[PDB]
């Protein structure tokens, strides 16, 4: 349709006829709105006029007309009839108009899929998601999500390699898209963001998908959304342990302060006071800070799957343990002193790796894990090894039933675990001694420590029995 | 290029004042929310937000100007001027181009700052030679910020 | 030459800035504004339009961009359809500038 050309006139004189045809069909369905297609069995007169009319339509060989009718069906929303044509003519017509409009591309893709041509649909959807057409972020998320699905299934005549490469590009773009969508939503809803800025954020984020650098620098880092920063380091395969840990430290501290604030507001309601202007009260005890913090760690863990570089257990577990000590998230407030260990075990950290780290914590005596607070470190080790023992015992029972002989990867216990418990007993003996000669009077934790000793000895016994042959005889009857 | 969603979260989290602006010379935009500032590369499809929240009072103006010659290391390409209701703050900027075609932005502290005074600052402009001029919505007066590398017993690094 | 660019409902324009290098076809007023001379020495000017919802990129179009686009609409037309479009260019730019644009597009 080159402008300035003089066939336009010829096209316009046909468009006036085609429009009038629309009115006829429109008035037809209108006149016969509520009329049944069959009465007493055979067809009515209102039905026959519908067939006679639509006959004339499908009996035409005017091509500009049939194009105008495809466009018209699309307009009125009749996916009913258009997807049921059969003809390629309509496919070929769509193949030209696809890279141009979202609605048309969706029709094309629908045609492909019903013909088991999933890969071709995934290609159209992906390109559309990367394009500069006016498409919203959420629609780009839907397009990518569909492409991902369609590229993950076999399409005949296309190599596995070509499928996987597309499925992979869609998966990466979908991950980034979801991040961008989380940002945009949070920023717009953020009470501490000026309206003037929000409109600006909506303009640059509710469109084509942006790079991970931009999302980090211009948005996630500026607004201190550290959880999203971490997801971004994951999606970018960001190799930088120090920055990752700095972000973990900021996330923990930010969450702690927020939980503290919410518990304060609550305490004011239960005392009669008034909350700051524009502060929605809490009608129910909010969670203690260590509970909200660990909630944050879980949400991220499930989103990244522990196999990431944003979960270096050797650095992250000591930091969380550090937090617990330095912020009195312990028995004084009614929390389980082993909560940090429980958290990472349920999360699915392998028992061997846990004990391995805890050993390092105990040997190096760093940051807060010093003096008599190593009492706490010993308790964590006791709890970790205890769970490990229980695991080995159940895996033994497990393999006696469903019979066979195996055990790969999983670290297996060595004498080092036994030695570790020996040293742990020494540390306790040392802490108890130092506690008995403190200035001001003996320490109050005498029996508390005597108990821990018994537990540790019990565990060394068990571990010694397993190590000593009771582990190779677990699938045997006693 | 849509505004990142995280900026919308901060903007709608604004208590008193927000503002948007452009650094078109380097393909960056910025948003201020109260005493916090966020920059981002708008050419990037999923930008990361460069956050700067050292400021104590509401930001009223932000600008990117050339540096004064013979003051900073050659790798410093610009100076970021941040005006609040209490002071004006200078930050070193290095906007080095990347393989993708969008400048990589890193910020440097300077210890250069001056108390604002009684006159609002809503407009900041810079000359080719790095001179920084200020004006606002209190009066028609025009101020200039001076700065130098050396500290002196009779003169501060920034005036 | 003028045009109206529509922004969607809700778009409040905040600022507009140049993203490319400042335009200059010469070093003094005479010759300075000669867009035609620099069509192939510096990219067309681009401008970032900041709104409360995003950043829109607006690009200046050169004669060769207009000429190529116009000819792209003449691909499906007559021998006289091109001559008509070409005469528009000659009446505005003159014959030499128009034929130079055709050579460039070619």
């Amino acid at each position: 349709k080159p402008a300035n050309d003089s066939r336009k006139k010829a096209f316009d004189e046909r468009k006036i006829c085609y429009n009038l045809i629309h009115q006829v069909l429109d008035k037809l369905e209108s006149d016969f709105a509520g009329e049944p297609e069959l009465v007493d069995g055979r067809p009515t007169l209102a039905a026959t006029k519908r067939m006679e009319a639509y006959n004339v339509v499908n009996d035409s060989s005017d091509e500009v007309f049939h194009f105008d009718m495809y466009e018209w069906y699309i307009e009125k929303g009749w996916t009913d009839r258009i997807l049921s044509i059969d003809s390629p003519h309509v496919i070929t017509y769509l193949q030209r108009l696809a890279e141009t409009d979202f609605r048309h591309a969706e029709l094309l893709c629908r045609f492909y899929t019903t013909r088991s041509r999933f890969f071709e649909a995934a290609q159209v959807q992906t390109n559309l998601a990367k394009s500069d057409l006016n498409i919203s972020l959420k629609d780009r998320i839907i397009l990518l999500s569909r492409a991902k699905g369609n590229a993950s299934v076999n399409t005949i005549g296309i190599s596995r390699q070509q499928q996987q490469q597309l499925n992979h590009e869609a998966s990466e773009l979908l991950e980034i898209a979801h991040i961008q969508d989380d940002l945009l939503e949070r920023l717009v809803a953020d009470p501490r963001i000026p309206e003037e800025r929000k409109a600006e954020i909506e303009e640059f984020l509710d469109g084509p998908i942006r790079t991970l650098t931009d999302l980090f620098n211009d948005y996630a880092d500026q607004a201190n959304y550290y959880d999203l920063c971490l997801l971004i380091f994951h999606a970018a395969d960001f190799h930088n342990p120090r920055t990752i840990m700095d972000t973990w430290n900021n996330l923990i501290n930010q969450s702690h302060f927020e939980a503290e604030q919410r518990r304060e507001y609550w305490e004011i309601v239960q005392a009669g006071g008034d909350l700051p202007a524009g502060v929605i009260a809490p009608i129910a005890e909010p969670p203690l800070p260590y509970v909200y913090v660990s909630q944050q760690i879980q949400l991220i863990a499930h989103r990244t799957s522990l196999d990431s570089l944003i979960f270096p257990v050797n650095s992250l577990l000591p930091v969380v343990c550090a937090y617990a000590i330095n912020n009195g998230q312990d028995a004084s407030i009614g929390a389980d002193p082993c909560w940090p260990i429980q958290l990472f075990l349920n999360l699915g950290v392998p028992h061997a790796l846990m004990v391995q780290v805890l050993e390092n914590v105990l040997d190096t005596q760093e940051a807060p894990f010093t003096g008599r607070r190593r009492k706490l470190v010993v308790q964590w080790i006791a709890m970790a090894v205890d769970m490990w023992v229980r695991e080995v015992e159940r895996r033994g029972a497990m393999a006696a039933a469903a019979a066979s002989g195996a055990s790969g990867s999983e670290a297996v216990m060595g004498s080092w675990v036994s030695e570790l418990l020996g040293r742990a007993d020494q540390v306790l003996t040392q802490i108890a001694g130092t506690g008995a000669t403190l200035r001001g009077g003996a320490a109050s934790d005498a029996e508390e420590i005597a108990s821990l000793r018994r537990t540790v000895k019990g565990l060394k016994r068990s571990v010694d029995m397993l190590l000593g042959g009771e582990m190779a005889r677990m699938s045997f009857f006693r | 290029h849509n505004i990142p969603d995280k900026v919308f979260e901060h903007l709608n989290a604004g208590e008193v004042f927000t503002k948007l602006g452009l650094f078109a010379e380097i393909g960056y935009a910025w948003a201020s929310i109260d005493s916090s500032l966020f920059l981002w590369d708008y050419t990037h499809p999923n930008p990361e937000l460069i956050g700067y929240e050292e400021a104590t009072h509401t930001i009223t103006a932000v600008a990117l100007v050339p540096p004064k010659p013979g003051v900073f290391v050659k790798t410093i390409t610009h100076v970021l001027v941040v005006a609040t209701t209490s002071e004006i703050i200078l930050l070193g900027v290095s906007a080095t181009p990347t393989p993708s075609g969008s400048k990589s932005l890193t910020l440097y502290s300077t210890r250069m700052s001056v108390h604002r005074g009684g006159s609002d600052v809503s407009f900041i402009v810079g000359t080719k030679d790095g001179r920084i001029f200020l004006g606002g919505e209190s009066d028609t007066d025009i101020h200039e910020i001076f700065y130098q590398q050396e500290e002196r017993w009779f003169s501060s690094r920034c005036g | 030459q003028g045009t109206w660019i529509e922004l969607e409902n809700g778009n409040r324009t905040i600022e507009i800035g140049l993203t490319t290098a400042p335009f200059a076809a010469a070093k003094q007023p005479l010759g300075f504004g000669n867009e035609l001379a620099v069509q192939f020495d510096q990219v067309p000017g681009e401008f970032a339009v900041l709104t409360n919802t995003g950043v829109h990129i607006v690009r200046r179009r050169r004669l060769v961009d207009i000429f190529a686009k116009a000819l792209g609409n003449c691909v499906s037309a007559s021998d006289d359809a091109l001559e008509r479009e070409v005469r528009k260019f000659i009446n505005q730019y003159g014959r030499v500038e128009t034929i130079a644009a055709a050579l460039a597009v070619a």
């Binding site: 991970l212 | 948007l20 920059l39 700067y52 941040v82 993708s100 932005l105 890193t106 | 600022e15």
Partner: peptide
């Protein structure tokens, strides 16, 4: 873009109205 570029040098103050 799924490639990150940190650049604290020249940002836009997130906590200020615009010039």
């Amino acid at each position: 873009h799924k490639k990150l570029v940190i650049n604290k040098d020249m940002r836009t103050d997130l906590f200020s109205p615009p010039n």
